[PDB]
Design a protein around this ligand. Structure first.
Ligand code: HEM
Ligand SMILES: CCCCCCCCCCCCCCCCCCCC(=O)O
Length: 419
């Protein structure tokens, strides 16, 4: 079992970012390697379809307790679905997935579309529109409402900003960083606010619609017949739309891709299939989630080595979505590749792999793809705009993946036939 030796390589991981794992595999001449990180802890990094299958074998791999505490404290929340395994988890996961009905999915499609269409005058009005900001604000409205949480217009900028600080909070992979305390306070504000809405739903003082996150989560009972304590229920209710709001990352990359590859825009208009393909390729191609931590429950024999009981595991997400034996020219933006993709649950894993119900795979993959479809169709078809000179670098050596400028646009003008 090959090592990238060192007492702790955390700072090295942060310096190489999304290309750390690839650089070590290339340099050590192997598909599997160990590295100590997060304070002396050894992690075996596994990749590919074969890495993803094993990583989501629940007989062999534990997730419970393997997220760094600082990331639990800021991104996901204490006691979040992300932090439990086994029966307790499968039961709770069922609640999340129960929101993802055909009707709720069309509802998020319709909200996203209507708000974009409604937001054109405002965007014509601005000297310039930062798409990272503008989309996070617009998706805060979609996401609160989709979750049955009433958020006043007056409060959406504040809320959006608190979400942004949280979503970003994995940048130090669990280390100390200067924005950490601000991250914890944004979460506290958002948790208090959702806890209030839960307590008040349970008292019958407010009335979220049947089938919304707020309603289902407030009234749900676990497999022992106990409801979630109010705080944990607010934490998990957030886990139902903070990540929806975080799609702003992908809206921004979306516009970068369409701008770099202007051909994609025409095909978004010409081919009703293509918006789906484009959205999938934005998720595969661009960096967001670097890797996921787990731990070996027992020795595992994998790719000619033994992973010892107790060692850490890191499923390489960016590595698997850019694996040259899974995708021809993994570093070329090419939506048409998804004409052939067979729907495998172990290659396209930018929001996790495996099974929605039994593993920790993202609950909101279909919402992510739906929202990106409607957003990209909006930007391709209903408006024209200019892209001024700006820093459009996406630095693959810096976690998290952002377009440096946020992706700024000007001279927005609705596309209308007036003849
Ligand atoms: C926008 C970009 C998004 C990204 C990059 C993302 C990524 C991820 C990743 C990597 C995981 C963990 C996979 C694992 O632990 O094996 C995850 C889990 C999760 N995702 Fe997302 N997701 C996004 C959007 C969403 C949306 C829109 C929702 C809900 C509407 C959502 C809900 C969740 C939940 C509740 C979990 C934890 C599931 C569990 O622990 O069983 N995500 N996501
Ligand atoms: C090479 C490695 C050693 C491994 C170190 C383990 C690092 C653990 C950090 C895991 C990163 C999780 C990032 C998840 C992205 C969050 C989803 C965005 C949507 C949301 O929840 O808001």
């Amino acid at each position: 079992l090959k090592r990238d030796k060192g007492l702790d390589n955390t700072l090295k991981v942060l310096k190489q970012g999304y290309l750390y794992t690839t650089n070590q595999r290339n340099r050590l001449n192997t598909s599997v390697f160990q590295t100590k990180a997060l304070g002396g802890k050894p992690f075996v990094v596994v990749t590919g379809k074969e890495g993803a299958e094993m990583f989501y074998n629940n007989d062999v791999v534990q997730r419970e307790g393997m997220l760094p505490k600082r990331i639990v404290n800021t991104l996901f929340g204490k006691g979040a679905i992300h932090t439990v395994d086994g029966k307790k988890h499968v039961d709770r996961k069922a609640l999340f997935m129960s929101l993802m009905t055909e009707g709720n999915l069309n509802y998020v499609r319709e909200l996203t579309r209507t708000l974009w269409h409604a937001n054109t005058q405002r965007m014509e009005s601005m000297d310039e529109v930062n798409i990272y900001r503008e989309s996070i604000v617009l998706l805060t409205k979609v996401g609160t409402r989709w979750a049955g949480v009433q958020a006043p217009p007056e409060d959406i900028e504040r809320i959006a900003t608190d979400m942004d600080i949280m979503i970003d909070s994995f940048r130090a992979l669990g280390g100390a960083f200067k924005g950490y305390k601000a991250s914890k306070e944004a979460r506290r504000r958002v948790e208090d606010w959702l806890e209030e809405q839960i307590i008040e739903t349970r008292k019958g003082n407010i009335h979220p619609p049947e089938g919304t996150a707020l309603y289902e989560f407030a009234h749900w009972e676990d497999y022992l017949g106990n409801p979630m304590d109010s705080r944990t229920c607010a934490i998990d209710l957030m886990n139902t739309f903070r990540p929806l709001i975080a799609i702003n990352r992908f809206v921004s990359f979306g516009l970068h891709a369409m701008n770099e590859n202007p051909i994609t825009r025409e095909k978004i208009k010409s081919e009703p299939d293509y918006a789906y393909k484009f959205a999938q390729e934005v998720r595969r191609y661009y960096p967001f989630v670097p890797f996921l931590p787990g731990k070996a429950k027992v020795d595992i024999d994998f790719q000619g080595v033994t992973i010892p009981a107790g060692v850490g595991l890191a499923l390489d997400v960016y590595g698997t979505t850019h694996d040259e034996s899974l995708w021809d020219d993994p570093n070329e933006f090419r939506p048409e590749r998804f004409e052939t993709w067979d729907g495998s649950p172990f290659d396209l894993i930018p929001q996790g792999g495996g099974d929605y119900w039994t593993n920790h795979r993202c609950a909101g993959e279909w919402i992510t793809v739906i929202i990106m479809e409607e957003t990209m169709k909006y930007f391709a078809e209903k408006i024209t705009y200019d892209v001024p000179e700006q820093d459009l670098e996406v630095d693959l050596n810096s976690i998290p993946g952002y377009v440096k400028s946020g992706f700024v646009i000007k001279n927005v003008r609705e596309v209308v036939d007036r003849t």
